[PDB]
Amino acid sequence: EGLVEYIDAEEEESILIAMQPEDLEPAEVDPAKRIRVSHHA
Amino acid sequence: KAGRLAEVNLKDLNNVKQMVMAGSKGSFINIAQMSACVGQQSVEGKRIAFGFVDRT
Amino acid sequence: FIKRDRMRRNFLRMREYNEFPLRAIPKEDLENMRTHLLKFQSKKKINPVTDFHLPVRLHRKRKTRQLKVLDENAKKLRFEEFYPWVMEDFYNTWVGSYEAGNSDSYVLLSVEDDGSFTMIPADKVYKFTARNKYATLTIDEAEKRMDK
Amino acid sequence: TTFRFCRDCNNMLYPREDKENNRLLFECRTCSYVEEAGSPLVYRHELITNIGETAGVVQDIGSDPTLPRSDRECPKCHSRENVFFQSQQRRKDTSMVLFFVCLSCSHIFTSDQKNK
Numbered sequence: 566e567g568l569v570e571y572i573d574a575e576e577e578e579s580i581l582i583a584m585q586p587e588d589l590e591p592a593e594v595d596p597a598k599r600i601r602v603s604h605h606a
Numbered sequence: 607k608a609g610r611l612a613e614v615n616l617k618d619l620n621n622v623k624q625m626v627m628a629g630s631k632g633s634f635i636n637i638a639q640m641s642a643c644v645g646q647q648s649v650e651g652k653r654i655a656f657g658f659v660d661r662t
Numbered sequence: 663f664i665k666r667d668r669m670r671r672n673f674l675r676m677r678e679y680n681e682f683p684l685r686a687i688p689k690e691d692l693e694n695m696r697t698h699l700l701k702f703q704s705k706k707k708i709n710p711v712t713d714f715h716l717p718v719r720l721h722r723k724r725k726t727r728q729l730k731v732l733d734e735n736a737k738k739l740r741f742e743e744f745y746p747w748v749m750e751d752f753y754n755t756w757v758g759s760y761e762a763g764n765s766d767s768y769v770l771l772s773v774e775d776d777g778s779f780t781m782i783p784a785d786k787v788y789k790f791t792a793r794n795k796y797a798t799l800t801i802d803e804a805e806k807r808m809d810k
Numbered sequence: 811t812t813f814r815f816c817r818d819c820n821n822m823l824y825p826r827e828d829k830e831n832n833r834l835l836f837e838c839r840t841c842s843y844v845e846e847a848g849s850p851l852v853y854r855h856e857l858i859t860n861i862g863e864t865a866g867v868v869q870d871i872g873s874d875p876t877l878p879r880s881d882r883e884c885p886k887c888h889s890r891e892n893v894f895f896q897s898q899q900r901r902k903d904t905s906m907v908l909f910f911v912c913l914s915c916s917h918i919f920t921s922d923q924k925n926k
């Protein structure tokens with residue numbers, strides 16, 4: 566269904582992976598939580 | 607700079623402070639990395655190279 | 663903060679034009695005639711041999727029992743003609759060369775006397791190259807010169 | 811620079827000095843074709859270069875996902891959608907200036923201040 570792809574290590578050169586869906590797809594905090602960076606990409 | 611900020615705020619209770627002070631085990635870098643920040647990883651004296659094409 | 667393996671409760675309790683007919687062209691011709699292709703690679707805008715010369719000439723220029731290698735016929739055939747196709751006067755010149763890149767997916771519809779066409783796939787395709795336009799060579803001396 | 815080839819020979823034309831008419835001609839050490847010198851300059855060596863700073867900027871550079879976008883406005887397009895990248899001269903001494911490319915006019919500009 567075209568939901569998940571295999572990606573080798575060469576092809577990996579030409580994609581831009583998100584790290585986790587939520588924290589990264591929607592566009593736009595606990596101090597104990599670690600510090601992350603944005604979906605600027 | 608962040609390490610000194612943590613070390614300073616530890617009170618004499620703080621058990622790892624009491625092991626640094628006794629010279630017994632551990633040191634500043636250790637407490638700095640546990641509580642404050644881990645700082646710059648590095649490979650051959652240089653920051654992480656561009657293993658992928660132009661990105662890390 | 664925990665791992666909840668009882669979720670299998672909820673997930674269990676939630677769910678103009680020129681049209682031309684083409685026919686079974688005679689084969690005996692093709693049984694003796696082989697229709698190849700040819701390309702000149704001199705950029706010479708037209709380069710038709712109409713202006714080449716006359717006459718034109720296109721042609722090519724004890725032990726006991728043993729086991730030999732095995733090989734299919736076509737390669738055995740194709741190999742067994744290492745004489746290339748040539749054109750000359752008796753002095754402008756060209757030399758042929760097998761191409762083999764696209765020998766297959768090319769059937770031909772030559773504009774015959776009429777617009778129609780018998781059906782003809784190309785046998786082979788040849789790359790024809792000029793030669794001796796300046797006709798210099800030190801075939802023997804080349805090694806001598808390239809080692810001065 | 812700007813090599814010249816023969817025709818009906820197609821090799822490359824070395825320069826053969828005409829002294830008598832006193833100018834430069836290009837021979838062809840295989841077929842005797844000749845012609846003039848369209849310019850008296852013959853050769854360049856180019857130690858310190860400034861090319862490849864835009865290597866392979868194709869009309870698709872806008873279609874490469876991995877390239878970082880940026881917002882600055884093109885001097886021409888005044889559109890504010892542009893990809894960018896460092897100078898493609900993969901050499902150590904190379905500067906770190908940025909070449910932008912507006913997705914609209916495909917105009918190339920630079921982040922420079924020392925020299926635009």
Ligand SMILES: [Zn+2]
Pocket residue numbers: 816817818819820821838840841842843
């Ligand atoms: Zn020539």
Ligand SMILES: [Zn+2]
Pocket residue numbers: 883884885886887888889912913914915916917
């Ligand atoms: Zn623009």
